[PDB]
RNA sequence: AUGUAUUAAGGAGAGUAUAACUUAAUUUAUGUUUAUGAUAGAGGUUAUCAACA
RNA sequence: UCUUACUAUAGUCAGGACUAUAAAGGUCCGAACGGGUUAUCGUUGCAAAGAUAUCCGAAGAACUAUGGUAAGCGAGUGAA
RNA sequence: GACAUGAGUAACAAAAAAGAGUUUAAGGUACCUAAAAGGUAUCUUAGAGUCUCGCCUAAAGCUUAUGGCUACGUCAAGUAACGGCCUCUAAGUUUAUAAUCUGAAGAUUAUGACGAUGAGAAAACUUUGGUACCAACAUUUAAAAGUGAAAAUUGUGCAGGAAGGAUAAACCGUACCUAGAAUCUGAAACAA
């Protein structure tokens, strides 16, 4: 996730990486 | 658009009047382009002379 | 040494001397254009 | 003057009678005392039709898949002047 | 040598409270002047009609105001009414595409031009005390002293809201020697009627309260002929 | 069908222009409408384009051209050129039009302003550092903002010195088969 | 900034540049809820009158997207320039 | 210069008697105990007391 | 660098889906062969998952 | 676009004194402006021709601005 | 091409000049405090302002040019309170036409076109040749007085002082900088 590609993508693409990070934190607990 | 509207057929060909105002053709293509292939008989007649 | 020969220079005299129309319109100016054109110059004049 | 002198000259650089337009079109003629007479035969108007009740929008639902036209066996399928004249007879014979 | 005042509550001669600092209202600080206790002040030594109407023009972009006795401003007004408020902030001339009539004040007396020449003086003396001696905006309101000298000069130019507050004050008897007062001294006094014409209805709301002797009308005479339509709130 | 002005005779049925309606300036009256129009647009066109397309009457139009900085074809490389200038027009509406005020920063969640802000500050700090390098300078180590990795090594330092935890040799430095 | 706001005509001609009358720009999540472009096949069944009226619906639709892009950038609303580039 | 100065004769000029001297005149501050220069006022207590006399008085 | 073949007017300015090029800046159709090719699915923007003529 | 001469169109020269004039003078003292007399500094300079003081002309053969013409086998311009 | 030496040396000296407070944003430290935070103080970077002092001042101020590697929200039918474009022409230019001369290239003359540094109706509403002319100098003139323009009146000297045309609002310029304090020319942030 670059700093100049984070704003070149639609919200759906961005909001799909947050569920990836979110689902990665539920297994660490 | 609703599916009922996209499927409506309203085009009726014509033979004595153009499909649209003759002035519109000047906007679709450039009358003076060097890429014009459809010329008028009066023009070709002047070019052959 | 070098002198400040461009102090008080106007850009109207630049177009009248080294402009594009000063060259296409003269026999000797058409040579300068073709030379710069054959070399690849982007700035044929001015 | 070193470098800016070499850029293309614009109207926002010099003022001593240098004029350059933006290709906005000639809307009239110049008078002999410095005024301008607008010839309204050259002025352009925009023909916008009444859009009340118009149901077509610039988008088509993605449910309806994009399909092209077949025109089987007719090299000049969509441009065939025969299928435009023959189609005219059946549908609209008068005009 | 100049003497600046301090933002301290003071008494007003007007009928209304022009500013929150005002302590009292309609206070006699000096015996009525010669023309104050006069039922019909006259256009004694001035041209016919002079003083019947007063105009106010403002820069629609920057907010600079100019008061004039005639329906049109000239190069004199820009020099004698706009103090230096910073480099590139005092225009070199009047540009017709920026200056518009802000408002116009018309008195009931159609030949008592001496009352308008007084209203014009308090408006021009209040405007000088807004560009100078702005101690009431140094630490409150616009906070001109907390701004850079560049931004401070831009706010000092924006005298349009201040000018509309000088109208509600002057037209309510503010000032000492204001001729809008009418003292009978048979000792009851009242204010003379007036009418303010606005190009923008919303512009008359810069004054927190208007007096009871002023009537508000929309549209200035001669502005419609110029194809300039007035701005109405009700629409 | 009677326009307030005089209409031209050249009919344009399929115009390709894009008109942008921009916000006015803070002190401008509410009867001025600013637009970004093509460079070839003129005052007569906007007056006719605003009435036949949007049904907006205007008593006058003003236009001014905004130039663009000269640049290099490829940013830092290439010949020196100049983009096409921009044309703005201010129409004097006959009916006032007032814009809405922008939403509060805390109420822009529909646009994902939170994530957008973090990304904006990052680029703001990378453009500032690249300007500090353009002056022939660097940020001294004493001025670098302590990151999350430097704040966790200071909490461990106070936990080892205090005596809470007992230091032990690392076990994940390398996966050797000897284990000694 | 503390003046009584004027009454703007509800049916004003300039309300056509705005997607939402409160926020000029449309939320990115609701800005992508559109279909696809008309294919030449579908446009071959329409008369000049329909194709002439459907053209101006795009001219006014493109003006509505340019206006939103300027507001979103100038007012720092947030993201949505990737969702509008597909709509435009 | 007639010749280039060698590494030896340039290292003599740079470090022979030009070693930075360690400051040894340091004492603690009576009010707070922090290290300060001798005969000098604490910089952390000066600002704090200087600011303490500006609030209340 | 040489050889073979083919061809016989060249450049720039600005703009544009930054592999896609001209304000239509990724047009619309035909025929054939498609893994024994050529040299029984998913996918129209989550696109252009097809080359030749 | 420097500079020399010419050319067209324009501008500028505080104040005072003398002289036959209100205005007739390559007159006088002296600013602006134009020169560059002498000395000092500077000399990898602030400056590939500058600083300081001093000095000269300052209604004229004056000075200045924007254009134009004339130069490189022959030599353009040259109060030289 | 890289890296040494001189050398951490010279230099950062236009004879204007500084002093003490205050404040904003981001970030670095120390203490408070261990619920993260917040608070107090301090430093770095980028700003802002207050009180006092001094410097330039027919400027080192303001408004604008030539110009611009400073920046792009700079907004006009015309006059008051605007230029260009446009009309007219001077010095001149002409791969325009005609004629003529000429080793080719070309040159000459006439006409046309083009060419400002000049001339261009009205408006606080507007669309013949001294019966002369608008070079220099001097004088007079918008009536309370003085001063400076504008234009005109009269006159003086010789060095003897243009050309031509007439007489419902498009397009382009409008930002900033004027050289002692960040922008023009001098190779540059140059005491010119
Ligand atoms: K003298
Ligand atoms: K010849
Ligand atoms: Mg086209
Ligand atoms: Mg074609
Ligand atoms: Mg030389
Ligand atoms: Mg010169
Ligand atoms: Mg400029
Ligand atoms: Mg300029
Ligand atoms: Mg011209
Ligand atoms: Mg300006
Ligand atoms: Mg010269
Ligand atoms: Mg003399
Ligand atoms: Mg003498
Ligand atoms: Mg000499
Ligand atoms: Mg020496
Ligand atoms: Mg030494
Ligand atoms: Mg030494
Ligand atoms: Mg030293
Ligand atoms: Mg801090
Ligand atoms: Mg002096
Ligand atoms: Mg520069
Ligand atoms: Mg303009
Ligand atoms: Mg104009
Ligand atoms: Mg001409
Ligand atoms: Mg001129
Ligand atoms: Mg200098
Ligand atoms: Mg100087
Ligand atoms: Mg310089
Ligand atoms: Zn201490």
- Give CA–CA dist F29/E64, Å, rounded: 14
The tokens describing G68, both together, are 């939103």
Contacts of E9 (CB under 8 A, 6+ apart): E21, E22, E23
- Give CA–CA dist D29/D31, Å, rounded: 7
Q: Give the Å distances, CA to CA, from F119 to A8, A16, F133.
A: 12, 17, 21
Please give, rounded to a whole number of angstroms, the shortest distance from the CA of D62 to a CA of chain G: 5
For Cα atoms B15, B21, B23, give the angle at the middle one, nearest 5 degrees.
125
Contacts of E41 (CB under 8 A, 6+ apart): E35, E109, E112, E114, E115, E179
Give me ligand 21 centre to Cα D14, in Å: 17
Yes or no: say if F91 and F45 are a contact pair by the CB < 8 Å rule.
no
Chain D CB contacts of G58 below 8 Å: 58
Looking only at the bridges linking them, the beta strands covering D28-30 and E194-198 are unpaired
Q: Containing H/E element for F61?
A: strand F58-66
Is there a contact between E233 and G8 if contact means CB atoms under 8 Å apart? no
Yes or no: say if F81 and F69 are a contact pair by the CB < 8 Å rule.
no
Chains that touch E (3 or more CB pairs under 8 A): F, G
Contacts of G56 (CB under 8 A, 6+ apart): D48, D49, D51, F53
Is there a contact between F14 and B23 if contact means CB atoms under 8 Å apart? no
The answer to whether the beta carbon of residue C1 comes closer than 7 angstroms to any atom of strand K is no
Yes or no: say if E98 and E61 are a contact pair by the CB < 8 Å rule.
yes
- Give CA–CA dist G60/D58, Å, rounded: 10
Solved with: cryo-EM
Is there a contact between G53 and D78 if contact means CB atoms under 8 Å apart? no
- Give CA–CA dist F78/E126, Å, rounded: 60
Measured from the Cβ of residue C10, the count of other Cβ atoms closer than 10 Å reads 10
Q: How far is the CA of H48 from the C1' of K28 (A)?
A: 19
Long-range contacts made by residues F62-65, C-beta under 8 angstroms, separation at least 24? F62/E97, F62/F89, F62/F90, F62/F91, F62/F92, F63/F37, F63/F87, F63/F88, F63/F89, F63/F90, F64/F88, F65/D12, F65/D22, F65/F39
Give me ligand 17 centre to Cα F137, in Å: 29
Q: The tokens 């009242």 sit on which residue? A: E190
Residue E162 CB-density burial (10 A; 0-12 exposed, 13-18 middle, 19+ buried): buried
Dihedral of CA atoms F100, F105, F111, F114 in degrees, nearest 10, equals: 170
Give one DSSP letter per residue of chain E, joined into a string: ------------SSSS--STT---SS--SS---TTTT-S-----SS-TTTTSEEEEEEETTT--EEEESSSS--HHHHHHH----STT-S-SS--TTTEEEEEEEEES-SS-HHHHHHHHHHHHHHHHHHHS--TTTTSSTT-GGGS-HHHHHHHHH--HHHHHHHHHHHTTT-SSS-TTEEE-----EEE--EEEEESBGGGGGSSS---SSEEEEES-TTTTTTT-PPB-S--
Q: Give the Å distances, CA to CA, from C28 to B3, C15, C23, C45, G3.
A: 70, 17, 7, 14, 71
Is there a contact between E62 and F27 if contact means CB atoms under 8 Å apart? yes
Yes or no: say if G15 and G63 are a contact pair by the CB < 8 Å rule.
no
Residues 2-41 of C with CB under 7 A from strand J: 2-3, 5-14, 16-18
Q: Which residue is nearest to nucleotide K65 (CA to C1')?
A: D15
């Amino acid at each position: 996730w670059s700093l100049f590609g984070w704003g070149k993508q639609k919200v759906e693409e961005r909001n799909k990486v947050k569920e990836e990070l979110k689902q990665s934190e539920l297994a660490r607990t | 658009t609703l599916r009922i509207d996209v499927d409506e057929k309203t085009f009726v060909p014509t033979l004595f009047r153009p499909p649209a105002p003759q002035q519109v053709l000047d906007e679709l293509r450039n009358k003076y382009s060097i890429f014009r292939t459809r010329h008028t008989p009066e023009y070709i007649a002047k070019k052959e002379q | 040494g070098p002198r400040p020969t461009m102090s008080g220079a106007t850009r109207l005299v630049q177009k009248r001397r080294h402009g594009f129309l000063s060259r296409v319109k003269t026999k000797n100016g058409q040579k300068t254009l073709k030379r710069r054109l054959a070399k690849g110059r982007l700035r044929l004049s001015a | 003057g070193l470098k800016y002198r070499k850029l293309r000259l614009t109207t926002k650089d010099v003022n001593k009678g240098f004029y350059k337009g933006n290709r906005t079109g000639s809307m009239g003629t110049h008078t002999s005392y410095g005024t301008y007479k607008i010839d309204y035969t050259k002025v352009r108007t925009y023909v916008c039709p009444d859009l009340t009740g118009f149901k077509l929008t610039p988008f088509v639902s993605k449910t309806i898949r994009p399909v092209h036209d077949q025109f089987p066996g007719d090299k000049l399928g969509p441009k065939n002047p025969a299928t435009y004249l023959a189609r005219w007879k059946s549908e609209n014979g008068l005009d | 040598s100049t003497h600046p005042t301090t933002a301290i509550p003071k008494p007003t001669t007007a009928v209304l409270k022009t500013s929150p600092l005002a302590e009292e209202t309609a206070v006699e600080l000096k015996s009525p002047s010669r023309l104050q206790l006069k039922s019909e002040p006259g256009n004694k030594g001035n041209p016919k009609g002079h003083g019947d109407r007063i105009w106010a023009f403002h820069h629609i972009e920057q907010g600079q105001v100019i008061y004039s006795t005639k329906p049109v401003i000239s190069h004199q007004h820009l020099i004698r009414q706009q103090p230096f408020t910073g480099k590139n902030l005092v225009p070199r001339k009047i540009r017709k595409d920026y200056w518009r009539p802000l408002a116009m004040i018309e008195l009931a007396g159609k030949d008592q031009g001496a009352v308008g020449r007084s209203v014009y003086q308090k408006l021009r003396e209040f405007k000088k005390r807004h560009e100078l001696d702005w101690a009431n905006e140094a630490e409150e309101g616009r906070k001109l002293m907390h701004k850079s000298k560049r931004e401070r000069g831009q706010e000092l130019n924006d005298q349009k809201p201040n000018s509309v507050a000088d109208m509600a004050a002057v037209l309510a008897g503010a000032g000492k020697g204001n001729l809008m007062w009418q003292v009978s001294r048979l000792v009851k006094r009242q204010l003379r009627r007036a009418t303010v014409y606005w190009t923008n209805e919303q512009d008359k709301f810069h004054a927190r309260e208007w007096s009871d002797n002023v009537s508000h009308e929309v549209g200035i005479p001669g502005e419609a002929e110029k194809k300039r339509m007035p701005i109405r709130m009700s629409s | 069908r009677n326009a307030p002005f005089r209409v031209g005779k050249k009919q344009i049925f399929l115009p390709n222009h894009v008109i942008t309606f921009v916000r006015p300036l803070p002190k401008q009256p509410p009867n001025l409408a600013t637009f970004i129009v093509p460079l070839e647009f003129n005052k007569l066109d906007l007056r006719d384009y605003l009435y036949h397309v949007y049904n907006v009457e205007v008593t006058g139009v003003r236009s001014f051209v905004n130039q663009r900085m000269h640049e290099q074809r490829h940013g830092d490389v290439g010949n020196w050129r100049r983009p096409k200038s921009q044309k703005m027009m201010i129409a004097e509406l006959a009916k006032p039009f007032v814009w809405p005020k922008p939403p509060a920063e805390d109420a822009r969640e529909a646009f994902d302003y939170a994530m957008w802000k973090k990304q904006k500050t990052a680029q703001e700090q990378d453009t500032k550092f690249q300007g500090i390098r353009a002056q022939g300078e660097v940020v001294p180590p004493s001025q670098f903002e302590v990151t999350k990795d430097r704040k966790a090594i200071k909490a461990r330092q106070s936990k080892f010195l205090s005596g809470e935890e007992t230091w032990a040799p690392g076990k994940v430095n390398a996966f050797l088969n000897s284990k000694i | 900034e503390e003046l009584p706001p004027i009454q703007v005509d509800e049916n004003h001609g300039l309300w056509d540049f705005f997607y939402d009358r409160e926020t000029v720009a449309m939320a990115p999540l609701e800005h992508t809820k559109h279909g696809r472009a008309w294919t030449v096949s579908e446009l071959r069944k329409k008369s000049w009158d329909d194709l002439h009226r459907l053209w101006w619906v795009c001219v006014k639709e493109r003006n509505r997207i340019a206006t939103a892009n300027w507001e979103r950038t100038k007012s720092e609303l947030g993201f949505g320039l990737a969702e509008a580039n597909e709509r435009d | 210069p007639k010749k280039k100065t060698s590494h030896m004769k340039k290292r003599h000029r740079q470090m022979a008697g030009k070693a930075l001297k360690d400051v040894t005149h340091l004492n603690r501050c009576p009010a707070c105990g922090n290290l300060k220069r001798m005969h000098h006022l604490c910089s952390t207590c000066l600002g704090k007391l200087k600011g303490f006399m500006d609030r209340n008085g």
